[PDB]
Amino acid sequence: GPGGSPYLITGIPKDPKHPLPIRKDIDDWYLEQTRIQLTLFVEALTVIQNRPLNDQLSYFRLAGIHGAPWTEWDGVPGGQKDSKGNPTGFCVHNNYTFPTWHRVYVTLYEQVIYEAMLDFIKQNVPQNGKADWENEAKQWRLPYWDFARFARDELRLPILVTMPMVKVLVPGQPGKQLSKPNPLYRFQMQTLMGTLERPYAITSSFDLPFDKCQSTTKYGLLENYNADVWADGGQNWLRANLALNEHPWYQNLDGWDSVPTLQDMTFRLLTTGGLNWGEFSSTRYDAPKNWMNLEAIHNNVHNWVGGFMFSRPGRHDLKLWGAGHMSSVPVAAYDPIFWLHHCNIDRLTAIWQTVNSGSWFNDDKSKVSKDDDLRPFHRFCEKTRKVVFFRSDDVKDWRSLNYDYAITKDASRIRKEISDLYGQRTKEVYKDFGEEDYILSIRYSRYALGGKPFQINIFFGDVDGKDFYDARSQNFVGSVFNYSVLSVSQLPARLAVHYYKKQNKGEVPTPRYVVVNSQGKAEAEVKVEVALHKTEGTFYDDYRRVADGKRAEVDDAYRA
Amino acid sequence: SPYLITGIPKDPKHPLPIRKDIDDWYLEQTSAGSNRIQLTLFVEALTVIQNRPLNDQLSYFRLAGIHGAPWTEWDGVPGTGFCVHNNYTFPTWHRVYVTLYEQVIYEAMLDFIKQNVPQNGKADWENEAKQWRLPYWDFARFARDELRLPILVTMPMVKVLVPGQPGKQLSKPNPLYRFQMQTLMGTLERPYAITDLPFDKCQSTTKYGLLENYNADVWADGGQNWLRANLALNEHPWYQNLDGWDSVPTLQDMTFRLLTTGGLNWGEFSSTRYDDAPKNWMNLEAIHNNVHNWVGGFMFSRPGRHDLKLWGAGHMSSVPVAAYDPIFWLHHCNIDRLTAIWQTVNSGSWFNDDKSKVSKDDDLRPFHRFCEKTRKVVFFRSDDVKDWRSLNYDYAITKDASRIRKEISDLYGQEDYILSIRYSRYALGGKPFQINIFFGDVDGKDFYDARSQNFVGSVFNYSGAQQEQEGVLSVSQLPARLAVHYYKKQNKGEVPTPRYVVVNSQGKAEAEVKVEVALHKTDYRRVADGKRAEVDDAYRA
Ligand SMILES: [Cu+2]
Ligand SMILES: [Cu+2]
Ligand SMILES: [Cu+2]
Ligand SMILES: [Cu+2]
């Protein structure tokens, strides 16, 4: 760490005047001051992003812990590989410590920002305001992006992430505000990341031209544009919002109400009882009612924010594809929204813990991993007086890290809060249809394309052999993203089954699936086990398999 | 002041330098090798000009301010804006305006060299400045399957050389990507504040970035949705997106027709102006108007429920603020080039029909030049720029008149039916609107663009209690041959009655606006008259 010693991750230090400050919803937090906390976050994160590569607390090196360029951090060796020779970073994916590794990672980022806020105040704030500004730094916590809450009719990226510039206070010049580049909009380096000084160049597990990016992008990388466009492909936040609002195709027809699948999934995750930690925490699969898990929802959000398809076959005037950092595990942590996403993944973990309090590494699968060192994160152990790595039990109570969430302050009201935030639209629309539920189970290998990402799209009815991609594609039901031992996910299917039955004289639909690669082509040799399951009764008030999945064929020009 | 507009001064080592296609030029600058001196000069000079203060009349703000808002004086000429629209001096007023911009950039390049280039490098950098001319955006050429905005306009940053620091290239904000001020344009010091579309709430120019129902702070910089602009630029009939059909972008067909149709007089070619034939309504200014709309976006909202949001507004659609977007000047550079091409193949047609003759000697305020005969400062006049080479630039395509027809064919052309459209720019009191034409049933909730069922093409009213000049209207023309062939095929051979909807900036149909639309067939004969289509109740203005 800086100054030649380990960096001890503690969370923001405890101050008696600041009891368990909350991580706020970033839109609420922004809307209430659109101002010292905003200024402090902007100015601190700007300094962190501008730090040199040799500074381990630079934004680059902190994002670098997750994946590429796979260097050491805080004295902990990097350059790890898989059994097959593939490079890997420190982040935990497809394992039961996924939530706890990321809990610590988010806290590291928050703590580094707080320390940068204190330094900013020391260097910039006049004597008359120092206590005031220190007081706000001590109350500030990393905001979360509530990807499943309707923004102030639809799910959206945070307001702040969609603003290229932001107005900040100038300490010492009351009333004076300056518009500055918004460090939440993108992370920009001074050159292409493929040409950074050794050993930090971003070079290739990926096929997208991330080596040719200077800035992070959302949907900005498309084939057949000049390679200099990829230096900064922009923030197509409107396109990301569209993806975030994925729902069955039939709901865009007149006379049908839509429900965002991400909100339905999140409401199911938080309200379904009876899952053990191993079921909730991860996609890892070594019963299908229990395959709706935190990591699978998180994987879909990564895809929807960044985009993963670089090309599409054929001629299209409207180009709905485009790729970006958030879809790709080796580089997703460079996009500033990454941390806000993972802050909400931490919040969802804390909510689920609160309403499943006996379910902590409590199954035979996850028990094995409970004691894993969460490298590279150090802490001082006061019992043995040694610097050690974090372990999951160290962060079981997130409040040990001196932050909390509003929703977890009161267990007795949390079930109504979950329903108010995430369940109203689902119940509104489900209420109109009979008392039964349908779900799709999805099981795949994250390695089926040799580690390359892919998207599993499911359809009810005939598939358009040139359009098998998204909610605009005829008969689309939903998607599962391999944000790359098996992996599982689950999709709601209740509403899409109703529409299909109405069109097909009551027949149960065969789920049809297509595995789509980053070139927009169908992969014919990626195995997916898809099934449709039914129970009597609504989920928010005994599932049986009612149809087996089948691979759909696509047009010859669209085959991998 | 006065600022004498001359074009870049002549230097015998640089005979009549050409204004290059900006994509070709960008590729030469960045691919040929690492010696990107012209690119560096243009980027650095334009950055300096954009950062000059408002009381400097050679600041980017003030040069863009000549066109429209904030409607102030320029060069001692009292401050509608100075730009000429819907009149026969549209091409010549804009010829001088583009030359002013090029000249100011050149002078700033010389200043950059004086400031930053070591003595022993000055001759080399000056040589590149003297060869440089303002590149044009060829909006009708397939980009190096489709029409596109310039590569360089779609890049947030651009790498430049640092003179005297060999090999060091630095990444800088690209001044062609946007014009960004330090505050919202509605809060600039009097008298410069820009203060419907919320342009007063913008700090930066935007393409499709202003949408209703987002936080107003998003409008400060709505971004550059160049993919969405490119989609608009490739507008064509809806049926061409069905499986099995070839597409042809209407803009390229229109541009080919403009350049190759013979027999137009200057009044027909130069402007939308119709002073009280339809075969001759394909004119320079109408094509230019559609490109303004397609680059910027004009619709702030849309009624109803839509997950896919294809609307969004921005500066290029709006006469009062379009000149702030740096692509404005590259668009107008190509409009100047199309004018020079048409002049070359129609050499006796210059303000000498009974309609356009009256405007030939209009002073092109506020642009000054020195008159050699009287030794007096005077305003530019059209005849002063009839030969664009007198301003010491040329285009490759006009350097060889003998090969021009084949070049036009190679670039843009690789019975007939046409649509005629005659409208008042003041049908909505001067507000902009879009005239969409359909063959067949119109979808009452989707009457907007090529994704709308049975769409054939559009005409954009680039304008903005108030009325048009008495006796004056505006005309445009659309190709319709392929669209009529499809309609007949699907409808038992019926010749379609053109159906039109007039769309406002809220995405609503203006039921009270009447436009004259007709279909003509080849010796063109009128074969069907247009009628307004109704839309859904929730989508009616
Ligand atoms: Cu991760
Ligand atoms: Cu993640
Ligand atoms: Cu103009
Ligand atoms: Cu114009």
Automatic annotation (TrEMBL), chain A:
One term under GO cellular component: nucleus
Keywords from the named record: Copper, Melanin biosynthesis, Metal-binding, Monooxygenase, Oxidoreductase
Keyword Oxidoreductase: yes
Superkingdom, taxonomy of origin: Eukaryota
Top-rank EC class of the record's enzyme: oxidoreductase
Catalytic activity: 2 L-dopa + O2 = 2 L-dopaquinone + 2 H2O; L-tyrosine + O2 = L-dopaquinone + H2O
Comp. bias (Basic and acidic residues): 542-560
PROSITE patterns: TYROSINASE_1 (PS00497), TYROSINASE_2 (PS00498)
Region annotation (Disordered) ranges: 542-560
Domain Tyrosinase copper-binding, first and last residues per copy: 93-110, 335-346
Cited InterPro entries: C11orf54_DUF1907 (IPR015021), Di-copper_centre_dom_sf (IPR008922), Tyrosinase/Hemocyanin (IPR050316), Tyrosinase_C (IPR041640), Tyrosinase_Cu-bd (IPR002227)
Protein's recorded name: tyrosinase
